[PDB]
Amino acid sequence: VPTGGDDPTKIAMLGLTFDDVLLLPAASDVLPANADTSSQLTKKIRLKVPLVSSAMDTVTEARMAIAMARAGGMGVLHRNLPVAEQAAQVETVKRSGGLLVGAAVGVGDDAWERAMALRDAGVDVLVVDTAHAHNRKVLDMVHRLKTTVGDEIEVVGGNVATRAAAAALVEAGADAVKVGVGPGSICTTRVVAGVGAPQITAILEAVAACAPHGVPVIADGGLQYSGDIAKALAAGASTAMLGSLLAGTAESPGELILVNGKQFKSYRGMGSLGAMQLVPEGIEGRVPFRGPLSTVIHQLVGGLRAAMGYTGSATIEELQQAQFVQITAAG
Amino acid sequence: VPTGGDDPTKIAMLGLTFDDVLLLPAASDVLPANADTSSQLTKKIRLKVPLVSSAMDTVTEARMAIAMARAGGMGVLHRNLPVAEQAAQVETVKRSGGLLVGAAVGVGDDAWERAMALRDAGVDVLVVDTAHAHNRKVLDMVHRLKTTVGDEIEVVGGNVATRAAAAALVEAGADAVKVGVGPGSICTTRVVAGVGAPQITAILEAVAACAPHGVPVIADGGLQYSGDIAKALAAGASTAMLGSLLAGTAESPGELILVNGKQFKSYRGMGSLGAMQLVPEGIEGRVPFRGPLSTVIHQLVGGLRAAMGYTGSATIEELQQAQFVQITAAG
Amino acid sequence: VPTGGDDPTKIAMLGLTFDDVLLLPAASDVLPANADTSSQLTKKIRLKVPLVSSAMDTVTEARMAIAMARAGGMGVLHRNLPVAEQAAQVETVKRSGGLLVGAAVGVGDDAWERAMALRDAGVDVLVVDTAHAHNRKVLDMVHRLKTTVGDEIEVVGGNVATRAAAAALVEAGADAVKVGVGPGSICTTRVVAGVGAPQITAILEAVAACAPHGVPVIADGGLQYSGDIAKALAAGASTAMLGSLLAGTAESPGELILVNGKQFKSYRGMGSLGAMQLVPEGIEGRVPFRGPLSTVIHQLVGGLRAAMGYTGSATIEELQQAQFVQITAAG
Amino acid sequence: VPTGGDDPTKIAMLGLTFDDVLLLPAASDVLPANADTSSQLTKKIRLKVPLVSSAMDTVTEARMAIAMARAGGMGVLHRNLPVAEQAAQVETVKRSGGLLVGAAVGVGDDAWERAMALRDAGVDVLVVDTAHAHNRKVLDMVHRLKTTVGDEIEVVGGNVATRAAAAALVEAGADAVKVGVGPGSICTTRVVAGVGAPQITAILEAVAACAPHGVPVIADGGLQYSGDIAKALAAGASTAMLGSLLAGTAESPGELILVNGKQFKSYRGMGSLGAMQLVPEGIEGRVPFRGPLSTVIHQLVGGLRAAMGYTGSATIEELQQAQFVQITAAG
Ligand SMILES: O=c1[nH]cnc2c1ncn2[C@@H]1O[C@H](COP(=O)(O)O)[C@@H](O)[C@H]1O
Ligand SMILES: O=c1[nH]cnc2c1ncn2[C@@H]1O[C@H](COP(=O)(O)O)[C@@H](O)[C@H]1O
Ligand SMILES: O=c1[nH]cnc2c1ncn2[C@@H]1O[C@H](COP(=O)(O)O)[C@@H](O)[C@H]1O
Ligand SMILES: O=c1[nH]cnc2c1ncn2[C@@H]1O[C@H](COP(=O)(O)O)[C@@H](O)[C@H]1O
Numbered sequence A, B, C, D: 001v002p003t004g005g006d007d008p009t010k011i012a013m014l015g016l017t018f019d020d021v022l023l024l025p026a027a028s029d030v031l032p033a034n035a036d037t038s039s040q041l042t043k044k045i046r047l048k049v050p051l052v053s054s055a056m057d058t059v060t061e062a063r064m065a066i067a068m069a070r071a072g073g074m075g076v077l078h079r080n081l082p083v084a085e086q087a088a089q090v091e092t093v094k095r096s097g098g099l100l101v102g103a104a105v106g107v108g109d110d111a112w113e114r115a116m117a118l119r120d121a122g123v124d125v126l127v128v129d130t131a132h133a134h135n136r137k138v139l140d141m142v143h144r145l146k147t148t149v150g151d152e153i154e155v156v157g158g159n160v161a162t163r164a165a166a167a168a169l170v171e172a173g174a175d176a177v178k179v180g181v182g183p184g185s186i187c188t189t190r191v192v193a194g195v196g197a198p199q200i201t202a203i204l205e206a207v208a209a210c211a212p213h214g215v216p217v218i219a220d221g222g223l224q225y226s227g228d229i230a231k232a233l234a235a236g237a238s239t240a241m242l243g244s245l246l247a248g249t250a251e252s253p254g255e256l257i258l259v260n261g262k263q264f265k266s267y268r269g270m271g272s273l274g275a276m277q278l279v280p281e282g283i284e285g286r287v288p289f290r291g292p293l294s295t296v297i298h299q300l301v302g303g304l305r306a307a308m309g310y311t312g313s314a315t316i317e318e319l320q321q322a323q324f325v326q327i328t329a330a331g
């Protein structure tokens, strides 16, 4: 083995991230303005815009979930608050019309009680929200939810980074599989634990297990630019979950911060020291203030539309068949 | 597949850019001063110097096109102005002698009317100037022009980044094919849309479809140094189109700008916010003031001559057969 | 040969360092808090925490060795001091309970006399501490020690960077093999001599020679983050030796230094100019003050525990079977 | 072809530079102080230290050539001065004892007359000093010199970067072949012409043509650290020519320069604007003042000795058989 040792499988793959690849242009009859951006969030739920906001307490509470649903996407309400308040935020969303909304639950003690309270409040999507879903306890929670409320509510499981982990969540009954171990902008899992999987390769591997069963993949974390959304979808994901890109908006939780004449909002991992107040696996940071969500989503969808035009993708399903070129460091 | 998924074609190639390669020296009887720099712009038109200026409103109007033609190259007049003014700039060029001149048209509503006005004014080259030429509408415009004015005017089509796209433009009747999707210095297509193709690989692929039909390839965008011109030509291109390298000259549009004691000129993408006043795919920037065009062209041709000496290339056609070494990040 | 010459073996391998790889998550029933972090330092000695402190005079004297042993690891006392003082530091450690302790000796003139004095003082581990252990003199010292005091004391030999060198130390009777030629944070061997081996590949190669003989590998140098500890162990090492990560602690030798409002401690190679007062192969530097050792070790073990959870490793022996993904520059 | 086009030979090799590789440690009975650093400069001339100084007017005049010869190396007198002064500098060297000395000549008009004047003055080595030696005029100059003064004077030819070019110089009668097109620290050939060859690969290729004929290779340019000297020799070179590393010494031409409280000396390419007062292929720069040459040479040889110890190389001929590991960007 050229890299050392006698075992070819020790280093199992070469992991690519968004920056490692570009979409190749292809024959196109598609204009950006005419492309259909709708896509499956879960087996049953289709969104007009393939974007959901992260279940983080500096990204998504009721105001963000409302704005996301109106923009044609969806919010997933964070779970770093008492059950009653989370359920009350769900009802607040529903009070603003027939809006789609999701909410995160864990696999802890109150997790099941949390899930029932959220169902009572009328949630559409339950997101089993863990650092590592390749675990019997997580798979059981997914399964128990799907068997109990599966008729009324779609159940998302995450996060995974391998084909085998995605396959297990599919077996357990997940209506969608969320991919991302390591890539988050505020994530330090890679330096603290030494663990991760570059996101383009993780999506390709998860899609290989999920697509044959008709289960959509949510690409979660590491998206910095509107172009990364197109890359993630072309890699086979059906939607993208955004944290950093939405944390700077007016609709996110938290106040404006003025630093050296420029405006910011605070953005922090749910595994950061302050978010837990296990060693921390996230940082507490700041992102530039970006203004209204509707504005950000427009640019983001604008970039996606451009990619669909370049690749001749009339739909997201067609974009999922596009090809990449791998680039070098010089790129 | 080592990078993920089960489909070897998902990541179709490894894309190289100018910085990824160097020209290998070879047996030479050629002195830099004795090399022949002339080359085909189109099937019928040969330039003394293989350089054309970009169809951008911070690069090429009548003054630049005149100076370029006198230096042995050509200008392509930008189309971000009323038809009448563009045709008037064409006539202005012709008034300064028997000078070669090109002009950009789109595929829009007034595009055909634009083209006829330009023909009337005596244009030599019509450049069908689009972001993505692999499109029936673009191919039809190329074909319609070639069938209508093809005897009197050479028709260039662009831009493309793949073998298949170049082949389609050849089929449609292009007298030259322009290559560049992603590499421009002011281009943000790669981050906004996630789309592009590293320019050395794009040129190799386009040339593979164009050379067998005797159609010249114009390498457009991403050239930072005189050395990149030699690389592009050695990759198989017959000419190079320059934006950033010429935007800082006295002959380009726009005024001098003084910032922190240094002189600059403004340089902006045609897909930038201000150039359109579709989400923006270019930035508005500044480049150092470089002085007279004749000076810049001399250095640029000087570098090209040096490469021809090192590679034993007496002509551009010989340079197109030179070999590369690929370098690593450390280079 | 694509990289030059006609000899495929001239460039014998592709060397990976910690930053080149990530641990892949795997099926897990293991919680971070429930993982067993114990591991073999040598054939006979098992530590509760797989960490030892470097034999450097800005890292380990009696205070550090005591604190390391109490934290479940071990210190290796540096040898840049008279024999009597080193033996006196050994006795000082033993005076603070039944604490494990190691001490470095060379292969020089006083080295044997040093070793005997250390045995007399009750040392548990003798570390034959050289820049290049693939040498008959070093191997003989290892062998002579193992034959003379081998019943009472474990003998470590280092440092090596190849399979063949590790194999020779195993033949010579080493109870553990220490790996690291080039990777130290204060090391300039790579720029001064041009010599080295990236640490992940060096560990894989050493383990290939050591594991089949039941000899543990100590990964020494280049560890910057808690994640690197998990990577080194997953590559096959049984423990990690730390210099820079521990040099900033209260328990390390040396005073506090205040520079531009921030607190530091000095940290220097044993091959640096000042440490020898052969051209220098280390620098004299500064590291941020980190506070108590117990605090640093907690974070470090915390990160290791996280990795064990992600990889489903209940023990270090299981972690040694985990898989990597290789990442690109973009990562 | 994965990188583009249909021709596998278009990109002929993967070029490695010094930073791409490290020397692997190997079984050693060699102590740094006991290694034999002597090596062939040319077929007939062996130096005690395998280092020569560049033929540049900010590196080598009579004072440097004297100091180099006394340190066991040699200087090559630059040729950017009238013939009479160069010959007078040669005689000045000889006046300081039986010191070895070389001198550069070109292939120009006065080049032959220059060479004869230098022979008259008692030069030992004539260095045919060109940017591109793969040229009939250069090869003829080498041959004419070897046939005319070949009994009394060794003739070096350079520079080359390929196997074929090295082979041609061997055929022409060169007593040594100098390698380096592109790598010089003050060289801009790579950006101006787009031409070059990474130096480790260039040395491997040149040695493949030169070693079988017993012709020594001089590695010229790109050496930044003492470690690069060991790498170049291990790649198969017999000596290294140094510019930047020696330009900062007291013995180099030029005055001390004080910039922002630190001492420098000017260092400029022979192809820079000021050195010619063909477009420039070098810059005019500054290097830190390093003090006496004897001091610099000691560190440099010190590093080489260290490498010989690590690789078990008792002689330079043994070092030429050492192995590399290739490293990644992360290294
Ligand atoms: O503290 C943390 N450590 C690791 N990952 C986190 C943490 N907090 C949130 N995440 C994940 O990072 C995603 C957002 O990544 P981003 O869009 O790049 O900022 C979130 O949706 C989570 O999946
Ligand atoms: O706004 C833009 N977005 C993407 N490409 C552009 C834009 N404006 C001009 N270009 C292309 O970039 C080329 C100039 O690239 P440059 O020489 O690297 O500055 C132009 O000839 C166009 O092909
Ligand atoms: O001067 C030196 N040159 C090269 N390696 C050194 C030197 N001093 C200590 N080392 C090694 O570097 C290790 C510490 O590396 P670190 O933890 O990255 O700072 C030590 O345990 C030694 O193996
Ligand atoms: O102007 C120049 N352009 C390209 N190479 C040069 C020039 N001047 C000197 N050289 C070469 O660069 C070598 C010194 O490289 P350095 O030691 O890295 O600074 C010299 O021995 C020459 O072979």
Ligand SMILES: COc1ccc(O[C@@H](C)C(=O)Nc2ccc(I)cc2)cc1
Binding pocket: A130, A131, A132, A159, A180, A189, A270, A271, A272, A278, A279, A280, A281, A282, C028, C030, C031, C032, C306, C309, C310
């Ligand atoms: C994907 O988003 C997140 C990732 C981590 C995180 O926090 C860290 C502290 C955590 O949960 N670690 C952990 C590691 C192994 C296992 I097994 C279980 C948990 C929070 C959010």
Ligand SMILES: COc1ccc(O[C@@H](C)C(=O)Nc2ccc(I)cc2)cc1
Binding pocket: A028, A030, A031, A032, A306, A309, A310, B130, B131, B132, B159, B180, B189, B270, B271, B272, B278, B279, B280, B281, B282
């Ligand atoms: C090559 O030079 C340019 C590139 C882009 C550009 O502007 C952007 C906004 C544009 O045209 N985008 C777009 C993307 C897909 C399709 I399909 C059509 C147009 C302008 C010049």
Ligand SMILES: COc1ccc(O[C@@H](C)C(=O)Nc2ccc(I)cc2)cc1
Binding pocket: C130, C131, C132, C159, C180, C189, C270, C271, C272, C278, C279, C280, C281, C282, D028, D030, D031, D032, D306, D309, D310
């Ligand atoms: C692993 O930690 C260290 C590495 C080097 C070092 O110092 C240098 C000066 C040294 O010992 N060099 C040397 C090189 C070849 C041989 I063979 C022997 C020694 C000190 C510690």
Ligand SMILES: COc1ccc(O[C@@H](C)C(=O)Nc2ccc(I)cc2)cc1
Binding pocket: B028, B030, B031, B032, B306, B309, B310, D130, D131, D132, D159, D180, D189, D270, D271, D272, D278, D279, D280, D281, D282
């Ligand atoms: C190796 O050291 C040097 C390299 C270049 C140099 O100057 C440039 C301007 C030069 O000579 N160029 C040139 C390029 C092709 C041919 I063919 C001939 C000369 C001077 C020294």
